[PDB]
């Protein structure tokens, strides 16, 4: 089909110009929620 | 080979003294029950039967039931087929028609 | 000229018949997904008597990502940029089985917090 | 699968909300529960090198069937994946409840698995009806009053609510997540307190409509997975 | 002299002891059960129900291995402990007069075999073997109504069946068992609030407390909810 | 062993019920693709639920696995309603089994499930690649080409039976009858895992 | 003869009894399909419980196997109206020093399993308005063959031309 021809047309991204043994890490995620609070909705350890 | 009668066979079965149409003794389908002996009954004998093929008396040809009473012999090329009738196309079809109803 | 991939695809297609979905290619070669698209196109280009064709995902998105089953039709993706070819299937249906694969070599994008044995 | 390449740049840390494995309780036994849970382990150990995940049970996956519901560790995972939560405490994955306050240095967002509003939206409603644009505003209401939505709430033999922890809490988020609607719905409404974006992510057999959320200009982006 | 719904088999131990599948006309099918006059008193309902199902099974298809698996299933229900707990409700004439239907429910058994004939509290909140037991007097009192009424004339010993049965991931198993009886208890709460809807006007949120405070001595879901809430204290 | 005939039971469940699905001997709307019929399936195999029929199928598999060394070749026979002539004879093998050896090594759960998934997918492939004309009026029956058996006389010789396990065993020898003993034959890719050599082919007419 | 006589005579008597039940020459519920097994088979073996009729077919199969040594092509036709063609021709073709007792005893299972495969897979034209007649040689007939007896010394072609 011409779907394969679209892949034939798009030869510009040979490898996306990534090293590809380099992981480009994406996010500097903060996640302040995880450690320094009790979760109210969570169980009680003495109850469990 | 002149046969016997047509519907009056039932009357003939009444005539020698048998039940005209037999109504079945309730039977164990599983033979591990009956405490694996027909002798287990009350003060009088009830001799409760079993429709499973282990506890069946054979067909009584004349005055004798017959088995081979001999050694079964192993065969080298032999195809063995299964004897239970499978559920049909019609049974599963009517069962899936029964699911909306 | 990367036929080093192609025979490895050939056993998994033929000598046993479990389909490749993506992950066998990334396990074998650790090539790019664009390069994997090129490789699967090359396998499609150099097809000789495929038992049945693959269906592609489409790179052109328009807030839609759909596996194509109306193969002749163009299902809401009319001004199409491209397609990523994968899921080459012997069977009637496209189901693989899913398994853990080596990923420390193969992870294209790593974790924002990398896991610690601790 | 690449949008060349910006989809990876937008995507953050994986967030499921409820519905980890669909099953019905009266038809299930031991090994078919582990079949779907180990295939969930296959999925999560497949995606865990790529994207870190935050997981929550609570409507039809195993739960207390309450809004405060104990999230079940060590059962969703095979032995390959079981040792990661021992190795990494809460970073790459942790068990969180049906509500959770995910805070990105003060971008607090609330989750709901959906049952809390879906029972109101379909199961127990004879009245208050003048259907996505109707049911979108039911969880707007449930956000506004912070109130008792469901029919069997908090459902605990010991310590249900100790005058600190309402199941629909009192501290307000910037986005509430609710799940498993027929269609997609994503509006934003501003109140006198804060601004709140409405998130109704659909059930996955109802065409998915899978969503980006927040945190650049507080903007959401769905994509049709079918 | 009418015809009046003859029976295909008939159990015939005594005077005024009928039971058969009665049916008035040949065009009818699934012949009506007849329970007139029958010897099969207080009349604790489980004996009547198992005798009815046993006769229904013995009489629809004329087979006894299904009776075997049904009676063995019922002895598992008593033994392992899946008890509906309306199965045994005795009542002395201790206070015409209706100072009766007193709370006395002997399915409980005895922990230490200490209290003589004092399985009295029908809603006693404790663990498993003070709600179900195997070796007692009422296992004799449940094995005699099949044997005397039905199994005498057929000769099969249901007492031999009782003698044959009287002797003969795990945290995830406990978890999925908690899910099983949690969904069962929520279904019981659903049944109870739909039952208790007649006292609210249309409200549903206060339905839970009124559902929990229903106390019948005789209701076929209430005792299951009692043992459901007996489980949740653990 | 114990785990290996569980794998044989699941493999034969997949094989038998998949042949039942692709021959349209039961309506396809009753079938649904699944992983759980009493155990863990390797693939999603279209299985109709129909508890009499699945009782029959696990019955037949527990019959065939009961002998487990006489059988060198389990098979499935295909018979029309029109004639008793064989339409297809799907070949399976119980050759060089672990269970006859009773070797503990080796489990290789993922590897044996891998080769089972391969043989199932080959069965899928050569079950769509023959066409669909006269899609109804087909039935099912079993056949076993086995090397050294005869058990059917165990009903006889005035035996007195006491235990349910040998009640089952007498049902096993009761259910099986020796028959009296080509046109086309097509290749199928078998599983080639070490302890479980299942060299499976197909026959046409 | 030569030691196939006993299992051949019980095979024809049980074949006649199965024809009598499953094509209802007599009333279908006028039988006992419960307490008799013919060979080591699962299925029901419904012999007429009539002593005079079991003696009648006893003498029938005993005399046809008395004339076995020069017997001609065997059949059974069920007749009430004009059909004039054989229904179930289990042709007894006389062969002839092979020692086959166990194997032929197994072989009469598959003959009788082909019989029941012809019997349970068989339509219904009319209830009880038919009568059988053993004979040695319903709009339209139909051809159907069943299994052979190659393991047995005597081969039985077991044709059953229904209607
Ligand atoms: S337990 Fe009480 S409220 Fe519930 S259904 Fe029974 S009678 Fe009604």
Author numbering:
A (entry chain F): 0 to 47
B (entry chain A): 525 to 625
C (entry chain G): 1 to 118
D (entry chain F): 244 to 373, 391 to 486
E (entry chain A): 1179 to 1218, 1221 to 1275, 1304 to 1376, 1423 to 1488
F (entry chain E): 2 to 182, 196 to 219
G (entry chain D): 2 to 97, 106 to 146, 194 to 219
The authors write:
The translesion synthesis (TLS) DNA polymerases Rev1 and Polζ function together in DNA lesion bypass during DNA replication, acting as nucleotide inserter and extender polymerases, respectively. It belongs to the B family of polymerases and is composed of subunits Rev3, Rev7, Pol31, and Pol32 (24, 25). The Polζ subunit Rev7 is a hub protein that directly binds Rev1 and is a component of several other protein complexes such as the shieldin DNA double-strand break repair complex. Rev7 is a member of the HORMA (Hop1, Rev7, and Mad2 proteins) domain protein family.
